[PDB]
Amino acid sequence: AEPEHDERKRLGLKTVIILSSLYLLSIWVKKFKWAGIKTRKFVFNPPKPRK
Amino acid sequence: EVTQLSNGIVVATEHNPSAHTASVGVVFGSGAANENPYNNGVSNLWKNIFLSKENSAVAAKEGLALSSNISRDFQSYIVSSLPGSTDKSLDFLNQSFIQQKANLLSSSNFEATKKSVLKQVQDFEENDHPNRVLEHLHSTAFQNTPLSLPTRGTLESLENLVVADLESFANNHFLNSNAVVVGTGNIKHEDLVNSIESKNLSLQTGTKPVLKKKAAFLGSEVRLRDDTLPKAWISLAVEGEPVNSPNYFVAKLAAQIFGSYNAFEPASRLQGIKLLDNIQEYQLCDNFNHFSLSYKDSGLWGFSTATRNVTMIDDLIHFTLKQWNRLTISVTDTEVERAKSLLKLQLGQLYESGNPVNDANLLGAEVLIKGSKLSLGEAFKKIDAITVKDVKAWAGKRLWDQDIAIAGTGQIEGLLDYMRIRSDMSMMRW
């Protein structure tokens, strides 16, 4: 019923290791590029009502 | 000729027989970088005290004109007069600024000067956009380091000062080892030295405070958005060269390559600047200019721009940064040849103008760092020696894939995020 049994399970190990480290590397790159917005700081000083 | 003697205080003089005026001044090696965030603005207050009504009146009665200049690295106090009365300026400078400071620091005078300076700084912070944008660019580039303190002083800190802060600063920084006595115009070096020697003209002992932290550059941005203004003002820069760097003149020439542009003057639309080929079609900007500013510890190389096209800001920034990218890889010889003569004329007017006050400020600020003044002729040969390889070598180091500093105000909603601008510093096709 499954003559592809052995090759499927060894191509899977190759795909999982490649994809699991790609998935982790993407989190570092996502955080590196989002680093300028994560720590962005706002301040509020009410403008004068003269105008 | 420029003549400098270390006898007494360091005395520098540049003689010009043609001039009909003479300037005598004192330049101090302290500036707005020598103060802290709690007494920020003490230098400006000292300047406005020297320029107060009573001091200026007593000066102008004798026929003298007073100038004061505050910067990052020096403070200049200049007395200008006719050539025959150059000795009187030294007497006024001794009697007023140096020997006694009790009269200038009275209660009423201090309160009036403080209220005038507060009004000036308040007007500046709201109604002068291109210059306060550059001030915020400095404040964000060198944050938590001495060079980022604004020269005029903040509104909040200027209130807390009292006369005690002023006298403390005068005790700490107005010293013989920190001062240069400068003479410009129709005066002779020998006469100036003799006139100083006749009086004492001793300032103080020495040993000014040494700063614990040296200025550093941080890639950062500040956005002060205001939708009630008609334009957007933007200043962008990278780290440049300090004074006494081997690449100082290469920096000024690379700045001169792109130059300045005004959309409403007919002539400046025909300049050999290739950048205009991208700007002119859609009227992206009203004006821009390029700068290479140098200080004792670091510098700034970049541009500043103003525009009413609030929907096409990113195109302007993109095209400008692509013109900057061209420097590293494909600068051409004709560009450098035009830049040499444009720079020589640019430097020529700066150092050879009629007004001696500019010469006095430049000579005093120069001898306080170099120890001597470079001549006009020797300046040209270094300018003429610049080649394409030197420009490429400098640009590959100072602006290729480097951090930037940005400061903008107005309708800056069209101004994209930091990273999108930061990625424009490389081509990715090379």
Swiss-Prot record, chain A:
What mutagenesis or variant effect is reported for K30L? Loss of CYT1 and COB from the bc1 complex
- Residues that span the membrane, as ranges: 5-38
Q: Which domain of life is it from?
A: Eukaryota
Q: Which of the residues are on side Mitochondrial matrix?
A: 39-51
Q: What else is known?
A: Present with 39900 molecules/cell in log phase SD medium.
Q: How does it assemble?
A: Component of the ubiquinol-cytochrome c oxidoreductase (cytochrome b-c1 complex, complex III, CIII), a multisubunit enzyme composed of 10 subunits. The complex is composed of 3 respiratory subunits cytochrome b (COB), cytochrome c1 (CYT1) and Rieske protein (RIP1), 2 core protein subunits COR1 and QCR2, and 5 low-molecular weight protein subunits QCR6, QCR7, QCR8, QCR9 and QCR10.
Q: What is this protein called?
A: Cytochrome c1, heme protein, mitochondrial
Q: Which organism is it from?
A: Saccharomyces cerevisiae (strain ATCC 204508 / S288c)
- The full protein's residues present here are 259 to 309 of 309
Swiss-Prot record, chain B:
Q: Write out the GO cellular component annotations.
A: mitochondrial inner membrane; mitochondrion; respiratory chain complex III
Where is the major localization of this protein? mitochondrion
- Intracellular or extracellular location(s): Mitochondrion inner membrane
* Pfam families linked to this entry: Peptidase_M16, Peptidase_M16_C
Q: Which UniProt keywords apply?
A: Electron transport, Membrane, Mitochondrion, Mitochondrion inner membrane, Respiratory chain, Transit peptide, Transport
Signal sequence span is none
Q: Which GO terms describe its biological process?
A: aerobic respiration; cellular respiration; mitochondrial electron transport, ubiquinol to cytochrome c; protein processing involved in protein targeting to mitochondrion; proton transmembrane transport
Topology relative to the lipid bilayer, per the entry, is:
Peripheral membrane protein
Q: Please give the Gene Ontology molecular function terms for this protein.
A: metal ion binding; metalloendopeptidase activity
Report the protein's function.
Component of the ubiquinol-cytochrome c oxidoreductase, a multisubunit transmembrane complex that is part of the mitochondrial electron transport chain which drives oxidative phosphorylation.
How this chain assembles, per its entry, is:
Component of the ubiquinol-cytochrome c oxidoreductase (cytochrome b-c1 complex, complex III, CIII), a multisubunit enzyme composed of 10 subunits. The complex is composed of 3 respiratory subunits cytochrome b (COB), cytochrome c1 (CYT1) and Rieske protein (RIP1), 2 core protein subunits COR1 and QCR2, and 5 low-molecular weight protein subunits QCR6, QCR7, QCR8, QCR9 and QCR10.
Stated family: Belongs to the peptidase M16 family. UQCRC1/QCR1 subfamily.
What else the UniProt entry mentions is: Present with 19300 molecules/cell in log phase SD medium.
Q: Check the record and name the PANTHER family matching this protein.
A: CYTOCHROME B-C1 COMPLEX SUBUNIT 1, MITOCHONDRIAL, METALLOPROTEASE
Quote the protein name from its UniProt record. Cytochrome b-c1 complex subunit 1, mitochondrial
